[PDB]
mmCIF file of all heavy atoms in Angstrom:
data_model
loop_
_atom_site.group_PDB
_atom_site.id
_atom_site.type_symbol
_atom_site.label_atom_id
_atom_site.label_comp_id
_atom_site.label_asym_id
_atom_site.label_seq_id
_atom_site.Cartn_x
_atom_site.Cartn_y
_atom_site.Cartn_z
ATOM 1 N N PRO A 1 0.820 -12.788 -13.416
ATOM 2 C CA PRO A 1 1.295 -12.306 -14.720
ATOM 3 C C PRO A 1 2.783 -11.993 -14.687
ATOM 4 O O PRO A 1 3.280 -11.350 -13.760
ATOM 5 C CB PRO A 1 0.454 -11.048 -14.960
ATOM 6 C CG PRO A 1 -0.771 -11.258 -14.162
ATOM 7 C CD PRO A 1 -0.348 -12.023 -12.947
ATOM 8 N N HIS A 2 3.494 -12.453 -15.715
ATOM 9 C CA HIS A 2 4.933 -12.242 -15.829
ATOM 10 C C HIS A 2 5.221 -11.331 -17.015
ATOM 11 O O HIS A 2 5.150 -11.778 -18.170
ATOM 12 C CB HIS A 2 5.657 -13.581 -15.995
ATOM 13 C CG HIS A 2 7.039 -13.596 -15.422
ATOM 14 N ND1 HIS A 2 8.072 -12.855 -15.952
ATOM 15 C CD2 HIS A 2 7.559 -14.266 -14.368
ATOM 16 C CE1 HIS A 2 9.169 -13.066 -15.248
ATOM 17 N NE2 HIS A 2 8.884 -13.918 -14.280
ATOM 18 N N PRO A 3 5.548 -10.055 -16.795
ATOM 19 C CA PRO A 3 5.807 -9.167 -17.940
ATOM 20 C C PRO A 3 6.964 -9.619 -18.812
ATOM 21 O O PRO A 3 6.958 -9.352 -20.020
ATOM 22 C CB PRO A 3 6.098 -7.814 -17.274
ATOM 23 C CG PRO A 3 5.485 -7.905 -15.923
ATOM 24 C CD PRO A 3 5.606 -9.333 -15.514
ATOM 25 N N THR A 4 7.959 -10.297 -18.238
ATOM 26 C CA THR A 4 9.137 -10.685 -19.006
ATOM 27 C C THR A 4 8.903 -11.970 -19.792
ATOM 28 O O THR A 4 9.395 -12.108 -20.917
ATOM 29 C CB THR A 4 10.337 -10.851 -18.073
ATOM 30 O OG1 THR A 4 10.491 -9.672 -17.274
ATOM 31 C CG2 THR A 4 11.612 -11.088 -18.868
ATOM 32 N N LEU A 5 8.161 -12.917 -19.221
ATOM 33 C CA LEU A 5 7.940 -14.218 -19.837
ATOM 34 C C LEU A 5 6.611 -14.306 -20.573
ATOM 35 O O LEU A 5 6.247 -15.389 -21.043
ATOM 36 C CB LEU A 5 8.014 -15.318 -18.777
ATOM 37 C CG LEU A 5 9.407 -15.810 -18.381
ATOM 38 C CD1 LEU A 5 9.311 -16.743 -17.189
ATOM 39 C CD2 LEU A 5 10.090 -16.511 -19.543
ATOM 40 N N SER A 6 5.881 -13.203 -20.691
ATOM 41 C CA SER A 6 4.622 -13.179 -21.420
ATOM 42 C C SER A 6 4.846 -12.594 -22.806
ATOM 43 O O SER A 6 5.659 -11.683 -22.985
ATOM 44 C CB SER A 6 3.568 -12.361 -20.674
ATOM 45 O OG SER A 6 3.844 -10.976 -20.759
ATOM 46 N N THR A 7 4.120 -13.128 -23.786
ATOM 47 C CA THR A 7 4.203 -12.635 -25.152
ATOM 48 C C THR A 7 3.277 -11.457 -25.408
ATOM 49 O O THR A 7 3.477 -10.730 -26.388
ATOM 50 C CB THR A 7 3.878 -13.762 -26.136
ATOM 51 O OG1 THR A 7 2.844 -14.592 -25.593
ATOM 52 C CG2 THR A 7 5.110 -14.606 -26.394
ATOM 53 N N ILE A 8 2.279 -11.254 -24.556
ATOM 54 C CA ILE A 8 1.390 -10.101 -24.627
ATOM 55 C C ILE A 8 1.940 -9.057 -23.666
ATOM 56 O O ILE A 8 1.873 -9.227 -22.444
ATOM 57 C CB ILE A 8 -0.056 -10.477 -24.275
ATOM 58 C CG1 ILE A 8 -0.553 -11.614 -25.175
ATOM 59 C CG2 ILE A 8 -0.962 -9.251 -24.360
ATOM 60 C CD1 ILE A 8 -0.819 -11.210 -26.611
ATOM 61 N N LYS A 9 2.492 -7.976 -24.214
ATOM 62 C CA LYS A 9 3.146 -6.944 -23.421
ATOM 63 C C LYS A 9 2.328 -5.663 -23.331
ATOM 64 O O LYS A 9 2.803 -4.675 -22.761
ATOM 65 C CB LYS A 9 4.530 -6.648 -23.999
ATOM 66 C CG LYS A 9 5.566 -7.692 -23.622
ATOM 67 C CD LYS A 9 6.910 -7.419 -24.264
ATOM 68 C CE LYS A 9 7.976 -8.343 -23.702
ATOM 69 N NZ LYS A 9 7.541 -9.767 -23.717
ATOM 70 N N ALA A 10 1.111 -5.654 -23.869
ATOM 71 C CA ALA A 10 0.246 -4.486 -23.780
ATOM 72 C C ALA A 10 -1.183 -4.874 -24.142
ATOM 73 O O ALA A 10 -1.387 -5.712 -25.030
ATOM 74 C CB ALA A 10 0.744 -3.372 -24.701
ATOM 75 N N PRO A 11 -2.203 -4.299 -23.483
ATOM 76 C CA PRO A 11 -2.093 -3.355 -22.364
ATOM 77 C C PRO A 11 -1.691 -4.030 -21.055
ATOM 78 O O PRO A 11 -1.456 -5.237 -21.033
ATOM 79 C CB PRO A 11 -3.502 -2.766 -22.263
ATOM 80 C CG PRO A 11 -4.388 -3.810 -22.826
ATOM 81 C CD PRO A 11 -3.602 -4.503 -23.894
ATOM 82 N N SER A 12 -1.614 -3.249 -19.975
ATOM 83 C CA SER A 12 -1.198 -3.803 -18.691
ATOM 84 C C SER A 12 -2.116 -4.936 -18.248
ATOM 85 O O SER A 12 -1.660 -5.913 -17.644
ATOM 86 C CB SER A 12 -1.164 -2.701 -17.633
ATOM 87 O OG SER A 12 0.041 -1.961 -17.707
ATOM 88 N N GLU A 13 -3.412 -4.824 -18.535
ATOM 89 C CA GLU A 13 -4.370 -5.834 -18.104
ATOM 90 C C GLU A 13 -4.330 -7.098 -18.952
ATOM 91 O O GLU A 13 -4.889 -8.118 -18.536
ATOM 92 C CB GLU A 13 -5.786 -5.253 -18.125
ATOM 93 C CG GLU A 13 -6.281 -4.881 -19.514
ATOM 94 C CD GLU A 13 -7.288 -3.747 -19.494
ATOM 95 O OE1 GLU A 13 -7.091 -2.786 -18.721
ATOM 96 O OE2 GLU A 13 -8.277 -3.817 -20.253
ATOM 97 N N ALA A 14 -3.693 -7.061 -20.121
ATOM 98 C CA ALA A 14 -3.611 -8.229 -20.985
ATOM 99 C C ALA A 14 -2.372 -9.075 -20.729
ATOM 100 O O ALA A 14 -2.278 -10.183 -21.268
ATOM 101 C CB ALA A 14 -3.632 -7.800 -22.455
ATOM 102 N N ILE A 15 -1.424 -8.583 -19.932
ATOM 103 C CA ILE A 15 -0.227 -9.356 -19.621
ATOM 104 C C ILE A 15 -0.645 -10.676 -18.991
ATOM 105 O O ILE A 15 -1.351 -10.700 -17.976
ATOM 106 C CB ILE A 15 0.704 -8.557 -18.703
ATOM 107 C CG1 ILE A 15 1.247 -7.336 -19.454
ATOM 108 C CG2 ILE A 15 1.848 -9.436 -18.198
ATOM 109 C CD1 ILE A 15 2.176 -6.453 -18.642
ATOM 110 N N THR A 16 -0.218 -11.774 -19.590
ATOM 111 C CA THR A 16 -0.550 -13.114 -19.137
ATOM 112 C C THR A 16 0.594 -13.697 -18.325
ATOM 113 O O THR A 16 1.708 -13.169 -18.319
ATOM 114 C CB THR A 16 -0.859 -14.014 -20.336
ATOM 115 O OG1 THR A 16 0.338 -14.241 -21.089
ATOM 116 C CG2 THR A 16 -1.908 -13.379 -21.235
ATOM 117 N N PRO A 17 0.355 -14.795 -17.613
ATOM 118 C CA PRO A 17 1.434 -15.448 -16.873
ATOM 119 C C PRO A 17 2.415 -16.102 -17.826
ATOM 120 O O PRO A 17 2.258 -16.008 -19.052
ATOM 121 C CB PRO A 17 0.702 -16.494 -16.016
ATOM 122 C CG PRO A 17 -0.736 -16.126 -16.070
ATOM 123 C CD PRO A 17 -0.942 -15.442 -17.371
ATOM 124 N N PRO A 18 3.446 -16.770 -17.310
ATOM 125 C CA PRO A 18 4.383 -17.467 -18.197
ATOM 126 C C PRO A 18 3.806 -18.806 -18.633
ATOM 127 O O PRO A 18 3.401 -19.623 -17.803
ATOM 128 C CB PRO A 18 5.630 -17.643 -17.326
ATOM 129 C CG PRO A 18 5.099 -17.726 -15.936
ATOM 130 C CD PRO A 18 3.785 -16.973 -15.891
ATOM 131 N N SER A 19 3.767 -19.023 -19.944
ATOM 132 C CA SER A 19 3.209 -20.248 -20.487
ATOM 133 C C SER A 19 3.976 -21.461 -19.961
ATOM 134 O O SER A 19 5.035 -21.346 -19.339
ATOM 135 C CB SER A 19 3.244 -20.218 -22.012
ATOM 136 O OG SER A 19 2.271 -21.088 -22.559
ATOM 137 N N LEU A 20 3.412 -22.642 -20.212
ATOM 138 C CA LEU A 20 4.020 -23.878 -19.730
ATOM 139 C C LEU A 20 5.465 -24.005 -20.198
ATOM 140 O O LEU A 20 6.379 -24.188 -19.387
ATOM 141 C CB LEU A 20 3.192 -25.075 -20.199
ATOM 142 C CG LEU A 20 3.846 -26.456 -20.136
ATOM 143 C CD1 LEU A 20 4.075 -26.872 -18.705
ATOM 144 C CD2 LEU A 20 2.985 -27.478 -20.856
ATOM 145 N N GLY A 21 5.691 -23.916 -21.510
ATOM 146 C CA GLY A 21 7.030 -24.110 -22.037
ATOM 147 C C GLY A 21 7.960 -22.941 -21.788
ATOM 148 O O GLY A 21 9.180 -23.117 -21.744
ATOM 149 N N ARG A 22 7.409 -21.739 -21.630
ATOM 150 C CA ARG A 22 8.241 -20.588 -21.302
ATOM 151 C C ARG A 22 8.548 -20.524 -19.814
ATOM 152 O O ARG A 22 9.607 -20.021 -19.424
ATOM 153 C CB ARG A 22 7.559 -19.302 -21.763
ATOM 154 C CG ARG A 22 6.876 -19.442 -23.107
ATOM 155 C CD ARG A 22 6.853 -18.146 -23.881
ATOM 156 N NE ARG A 22 6.448 -18.374 -25.265
ATOM 157 C CZ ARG A 22 6.857 -17.653 -26.303
ATOM 158 N NH1 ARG A 22 7.690 -16.635 -26.135
ATOM 159 N NH2 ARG A 22 6.426 -17.951 -27.518
ATOM 160 N N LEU A 23 7.642 -21.027 -18.975
ATOM 161 C CA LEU A 23 7.955 -21.186 -17.562
ATOM 162 C C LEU A 23 8.908 -22.352 -17.336
ATOM 163 O O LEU A 23 9.707 -22.327 -16.395
ATOM 164 C CB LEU A 23 6.664 -21.379 -16.766
ATOM 165 C CG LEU A 23 6.786 -21.795 -15.301
ATOM 166 C CD1 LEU A 23 7.427 -20.688 -14.490
ATOM 167 C CD2 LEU A 23 5.420 -22.139 -14.745
ATOM 168 N N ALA A 24 8.841 -23.376 -18.188
ATOM 169 C CA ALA A 24 9.729 -24.523 -18.052
ATOM 170 C C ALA A 24 11.144 -24.212 -18.520
ATOM 171 O O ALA A 24 12.106 -24.735 -17.949
ATOM 172 C CB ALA A 24 9.173 -25.711 -18.837
ATOM 173 N N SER A 25 11.292 -23.374 -19.548
ATOM 174 C CA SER A 25 12.625 -23.002 -20.013
ATOM 175 C C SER A 25 13.336 -22.096 -19.020
ATOM 176 O O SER A 25 14.567 -22.131 -18.924
ATOM 177 C CB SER A 25 12.531 -22.314 -21.373
ATOM 178 O OG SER A 25 13.798 -21.842 -21.791
ATOM 179 N N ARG A 26 12.587 -21.282 -18.277
ATOM 180 C CA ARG A 26 13.192 -20.481 -17.220
ATOM 181 C C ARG A 26 13.564 -21.344 -16.021
ATOM 182 O O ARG A 26 14.620 -21.146 -15.410
ATOM 183 C CB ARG A 26 12.234 -19.362 -16.810
ATOM 184 C CG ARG A 26 12.657 -18.571 -15.581
ATOM 185 C CD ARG A 26 14.025 -17.936 -15.759
ATOM 186 N NE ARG A 26 14.314 -16.963 -14.711
ATOM 187 C CZ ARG A 26 15.487 -16.362 -14.545
ATOM 188 N NH1 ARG A 26 16.498 -16.629 -15.359
ATOM 189 N NH2 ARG A 26 15.650 -15.490 -13.562
ATOM 190 N N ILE A 27 12.719 -22.317 -15.679
ATOM 191 C CA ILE A 27 13.018 -23.195 -14.553
ATOM 192 C C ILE A 27 14.223 -24.073 -14.864
ATOM 193 O O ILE A 27 15.097 -24.271 -14.013
ATOM 194 C CB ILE A 27 11.778 -24.036 -14.195
ATOM 195 C CG1 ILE A 27 10.696 -23.150 -13.580
ATOM 196 C CG2 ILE A 27 12.134 -25.155 -13.226
ATOM 197 C CD1 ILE A 27 9.317 -23.769 -13.610
ATOM 198 N N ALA A 28 14.293 -24.611 -16.083
ATOM 199 C CA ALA A 28 15.431 -25.445 -16.454
ATOM 200 C C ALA A 28 16.746 -24.686 -16.348
ATOM 201 O O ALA A 28 17.783 -25.281 -16.037
ATOM 202 C CB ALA A 28 15.243 -25.983 -17.870
ATOM 203 N N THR A 29 16.728 -23.376 -16.600
ATOM 204 C CA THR A 29 17.940 -22.581 -16.446
ATOM 205 C C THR A 29 18.360 -22.491 -14.985
ATOM 206 O O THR A 29 19.556 -22.496 -14.676
ATOM 207 C CB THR A 29 17.724 -21.182 -17.024
ATOM 208 O OG1 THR A 29 17.301 -21.284 -18.389
ATOM 209 C CG2 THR A 29 19.005 -20.366 -16.958
#
């Protein structure tokens, strides 16, 4: 789970990993 790259920021257990396109935009940077 990535708190910064996830769109679900609450609760702590709902934080999801970085989605495909949001993980790809960070990698491209």
Side-chain angles (χ1 to χ4, degrees):
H2 210 292
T4 308
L5 278 172
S6 73
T7 37
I8 304 288
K9 282 177 171 50
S12 278
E13 65 209 41
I15 294 179
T16 68
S19 203
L20 164 67
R22 320 210 168 211
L23 170 66
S25 175
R26 172 58 168 173
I27 290 161
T29 304

